[PDB]
Design an enzyme around this catalytic site. Structure first.
Site: not given
Ligand SMILES: [Fe+2]
Ligand SMILES: [Fe+2]
Ligand SMILES: [Fe+2]
Ligand SMILES: [Fe+2]
Lengths: 295, 296
Positions: B114, B201
């Protein structure tokens, strides 16, 4: 509500990391270096070492299995316990991120030895090498000495123990593939060891730097106490390592040069912590052929 | 005598080296291989190609982007330096511990991504204000501290539930934004980074949830019921907080209702990863096709 208590005990805001602002430039430099150096053992063709391996004596193969399993034990501990133990004491959020990379790369290093074993050794060889690592008194002692500090409450001692592990404890084992490489044996395995050393060298320099920053905040009195502790601990690990080395290399007859390599790396480890060497330079003259195989 | 002698005398079991030739849970190797094979760094994506759609975007869209991304950064910062690390001591196998060191590092990579996007697109004042907003936002600090309370607690299974809800649910109010923008060929390189993040994720949530399922099935009948009650209650508490966070980030833009359907969709997925039926009826999860198509 179960978490109300925690919220009440931790009122400061939780911070998100901002890499656009770096309080200590070395954290970004090391993050970039270590991530830029990402690798996995599958990238190296250890299979090309089988003819070399198959020409190694039973004895050569045994010493190799044992040194690699002792290195595996150290990477297991540094990845799952050591690097992780440094997080609480980090000076910056960037430093915490670097430790997560070090933890993962230590797991990569540990798996690398299994990749080498699954490529060259027999199942009985692997089983026997791991059993040997569990029973060897010197390997278990160095592992427990280091773990004792990771599990303790002195943050600077964790850093000393981590630097001595990264810049000194691995070296009695790194000698073997470097010696073999300089004789055109296990040359592909040595490339994996070189990628491991490329990482550990940085890990030891970095953690040593953070130790220095930390210890410098203490009184001159406290600083002399930590220096004494460091040299006393290095002396102990070195004495234990001498026994470990004799039992591994005596049969092969490489012992004396490995001991020179041990003194050489003991001094480098102390230099990473900001200290002078424990051994006079004339006692660190390991073969220049081994040093150039490291790079 | 030695400072360490007592320790040594109290730890007579041998310290074990990880042996990848003996794998008690094949899922650990599957996940290690998937996650390491999926290694990436943000510098490998050409985010600079997004400067045009960024500078084409509205002030409202840019602000929501900065805030959503700093909120995702905060979750990755906690998961990498606190959450994944808290799972290590309770591992069933050594290979599982190795997987968690990969998850910790990759969460740091996600958090850093980010900052790469911000450094490429945003102004320094925009970045500084977004980090300050993150520290002051009550809903964001609340979701962060609720999850951290479990990581800093002493119940192994609750750390895994909290982790799975973070990985399979808490990031979604923020992932909605780049998926929506990329569906309009905006910030498409940034969306590619987001897809790499989700690729990770989704495997972390599946894996830690799998570990929770294995651990909870070992308990007494009464304890299994208590953990199921705990999981649905924590999910609802996080959901109600996420609704407030979402309305504040998205109301101005008017995307709120679709984001809420996306929250319910992912809440069910998170519960499924923990072995439970969804909390929301499927009819309440009709996320817009554009969003589902953009994920893919
Ligand atoms: Fe992450
Ligand atoms: Fe993660
Ligand atoms: Fe290592
Ligand atoms: Fe290391």
């Amino acid at each position: 509500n179960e978490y109300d208590e925690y919220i009440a005990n931790h009122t400061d805001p939780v911070k998100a990391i901002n890499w656009n602002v770096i309080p200590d430039e070395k954290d970004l430099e090391v993050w970039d270096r270590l991530t830029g150096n990402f690798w996995l053992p599958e990238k190296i063709p250890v299979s090309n070492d089988i003819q070399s391996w198959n020409k190694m004596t039973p004895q050569e193969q045994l010493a190799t299995m044992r040194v690699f399993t002792g290195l595996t034990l150290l990477d297991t501990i540094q990845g799952t316990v050591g690097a992780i133990s440094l997080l609480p004491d980090a000076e910056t959020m960037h430093e915490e991120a670097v430790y997560t990379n070090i933890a993962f790369m230590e797991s990569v290093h540990a798996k690398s030895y299994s990749n080498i074993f699954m490529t060259l050794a027999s199942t009985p060889q692997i089983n026997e090498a791991f059993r040997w690592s569990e029973e060897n008194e010197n390997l278990q002692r160095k592992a427990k000495i280091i773990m004792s500090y990771y599990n303790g409450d002195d943050p600077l001692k964790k850093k000393v123990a981590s630097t001595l592990l990264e810049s000194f404890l691995f070296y009695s084992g790194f000698y073997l593939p470097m010696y073999l490489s300089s004789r055109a044996k296990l040359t592909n395995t040595a490339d994996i060891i070189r990628l491991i050393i490329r990482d550990e060298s940085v890990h030891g320099y970095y953690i040593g730097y953070k130790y220095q920053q930390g210890v410098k905040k203490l009184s001159e009195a406290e600083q002399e106490e930590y220096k004494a502790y460091t040299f006393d601990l290095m002396y102990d690990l070195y004495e234990n390592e001498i026994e470990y080395t004799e039992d591994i290399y005596d049969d092969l007859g490489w012992t004396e040069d490995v001991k020179r390599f041990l003194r050489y790396n003991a001094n480098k480890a102390l230099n990473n912590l900001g200290y002078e060497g424990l051994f006079p330079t004339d006692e660190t003259k390991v073969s220049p052929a081994i040093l150039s195989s490291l790079s």
